Design an enzyme around this catalytic site. Structure first.
Site, short mmCIF file in Angstrom:
data_model
loop_
_atom_site.label_atom_id
_atom_site.label_comp_id
_atom_site.label_asym_id
_atom_site.label_seq_id
_atom_site.Cartn_x
_atom_site.Cartn_y
_atom_site.Cartn_z
N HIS A 27 -21.17 10.70 -10.46
CA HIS A 27 -20.82 11.87 -9.67
C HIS A 27 -22.09 12.59 -9.21
O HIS A 27 -23.06 12.69 -9.96
CB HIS A 27 -19.90 12.81 -10.44
CG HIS A 27 -19.23 13.85 -9.59
ND1 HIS A 27 -19.84 15.05 -9.27
CD2 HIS A 27 -18.04 13.85 -8.93
CE1 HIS A 27 -19.04 15.75 -8.50
NE2 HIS A 27 -17.94 15.05 -8.27
N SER B 171 -14.75 17.74 0.68
CA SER B 171 -13.88 18.88 0.39
C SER B 171 -12.47 18.56 0.88
O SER B 171 -12.17 18.66 2.07
CB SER B 171 -14.40 20.15 1.04
OG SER B 171 -15.20 20.87 0.11
N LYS C 299 -13.68 18.75 -13.20
CA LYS C 299 -15.03 19.25 -13.48
C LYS C 299 -14.97 20.11 -14.73
O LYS C 299 -14.16 19.85 -15.62
CB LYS C 299 -15.63 19.93 -12.27
CG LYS C 299 -15.60 19.05 -11.04
CD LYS C 299 -16.45 19.59 -9.90
CE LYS C 299 -16.29 18.68 -8.67
NZ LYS C 299 -17.06 19.11 -7.46
N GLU D 249 -19.09 10.60 -1.65
CA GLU D 249 -19.26 12.05 -1.64
C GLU D 249 -20.26 12.42 -0.57
O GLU D 249 -21.45 12.11 -0.72
CB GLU D 249 -19.78 12.54 -2.98
CG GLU D 249 -18.92 12.35 -4.19
CD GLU D 249 -19.59 13.00 -5.42
OE1 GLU D 249 -19.56 14.25 -5.57
OE2 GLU D 249 -20.16 12.26 -6.23
N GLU E 280 -22.99 15.59 -9.06
CA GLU E 280 -23.53 16.61 -9.95
C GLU E 280 -24.30 15.96 -11.10
O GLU E 280 -25.32 16.49 -11.54
CB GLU E 280 -22.38 17.51 -10.44
CG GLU E 280 -21.79 18.31 -9.25
CD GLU E 280 -20.31 18.68 -9.40
OE1 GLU E 280 -19.75 18.50 -10.49
OE2 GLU E 280 -19.69 19.09 -8.39
#
Lengths: 249, 249
Positions: free
Chosen positions: A94, A212, A12, A166, A96
């Site tokens: 992704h 996570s 990231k 994700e 984000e």
């Protein structure tokens, strides 16, 4: 029936010359499970540095790219630039980028088709938010996100795709995902591929878990039969990334 | 007097080879020593260009984010730029505002963060064809400027250069005349005088970011409120040298 275990480390927006020097040195000194395909994704401005310094059996990924070879897109990186610099992988879609920066399903698919046509391999990220899960849209969302790519790419193009699930619903929320919850979605994705692409693509496509992942939970997750590895976030910046690569040995 | 300023925005263009050739031409050029020159490569080439380019031309990134680090896949922070010896960043480019939906407040946040991290900023503003036809040129640029002025100190403007992009004359088929450009630049400087301070108005370079080439750069540079250029496609060509030298006879 078999699939090579796949561990990506997404840095990231993290790194400095000094921090990356130490990080790469740790990876270069590490003993890594030979059975694991490993990819790390530095920030774009550190890709040359990482590519030069990093052990060649870990390949480098960009964290994003655009949909054309070149042109008037200030701030964007082309897949051709990645190829020019010897960067074989790119992370696309992704969460984000989808949810903070508004990248639509079709834009993700455009990027994916373009990257594949340029000879890159793609880590294609999908997954649903807390609000979508609460609405009962888990299967609709992942179907829609995959369908945009499947409409755009050939059956052979999937050879160079790795799907990262994700669970955005369990990222920065009060919820946690269990290996069983992760396994349930991965099985759903694989069934979707079987029913929408082909049985072969379903059996050979790695589906990696992008929730996570850290040293403490990776061993349990890897035991699930439809989890083919991990897309690691914050732990990819730490020495325990090595432990995550070695989750099976 | 304000030092004349010429930025070259390569946008999403370049290869190691094409960039090598571009840099060698600049390294061999006879340049007007009174001109501050900045080049903005795609992010994955910033180290390359920074190493190879004559030190009297500074390097810029084409974009950055609003924090030092964290979970923003695909974003570059101003701290990384500082780390790599990249003194400038272009922020609020019309392509990022329009294609990528970057809000006024986001541009202002990025600008504040970049300045605080010790960068200089080329801050892009300008109005679309529809806005200009509706007569809102100054409403739009005043609004875009106000968002920055609300966020940064009077002293922070010291390391700001404003690029006026006539988005109405970029990809519209229209061309801007020096008189049209001068009229907007004069209104921007007056806006600075009345909303920021007398010093900021007289010190801030306001550079023209419409379609600048060797054939039109001289007459634009004669306008008393045009302090230089943010060049697009011509920055990829040998005539970039003539544009740098627009003030010479």
């Amino acid at each position: 029936m078999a699939r090579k275990f796949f561990v990506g480390g997404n840095w990231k927006m993290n790194g400095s010359v000094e921090s990356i020097k130490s990080l790469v040195e740790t990876l270069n000194n590490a003993e890594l499970d030979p059975n694991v395909e490993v990819v790390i994704a530095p920030p774009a401005v550190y890709l040359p540095l990482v590519r030069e310094a990093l052990r060649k059996d870990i390949q480098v990924a960009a964290q994003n790219c655009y949909t054309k070879a070149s042109g008037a897109y200030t701030g964007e990186i082309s897949a051709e630039m990645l190829k020019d610099l010897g960067i074989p992988w790119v992370i696309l879609g992704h969460s984000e980028r989808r949810h903070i920066f508004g990248e639509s399903d079709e834009l993700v698919a455009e990027k994916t088709k373009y990257a594949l046509d340029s000879g890159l391999s793609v880590i294609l990220c999908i997954g649903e938010t807390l609000e979508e899960r609460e609405a009962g849209k888990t299967m609709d969302v992942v179907a829609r996100q995959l369908k945009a790519i499947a409409d755009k790419i050939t059956e052979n193009d999937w050879s160079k795709v790795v799907i990262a699930y994700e669970p955005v619903w369990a990222i920065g929320t009060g919820k946690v995902a269990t290996p069983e919850q992760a396994q349930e979605v991965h099985a759903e994705i694989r069934k979707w591929l079987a029913e929408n692409v082909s049985a072969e693509v379903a059996e050979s496509t790695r589906i990696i878990y992008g929730g996570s992942v850290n040293g403490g939970n990776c061993k349990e997750l890897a035991k699930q039969p439809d989890i083919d590895g991990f897309l690691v976030g914050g732990a990819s910046l730490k020495p325990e990334f090595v432990d995550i690569i070695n989750a099976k040995q």
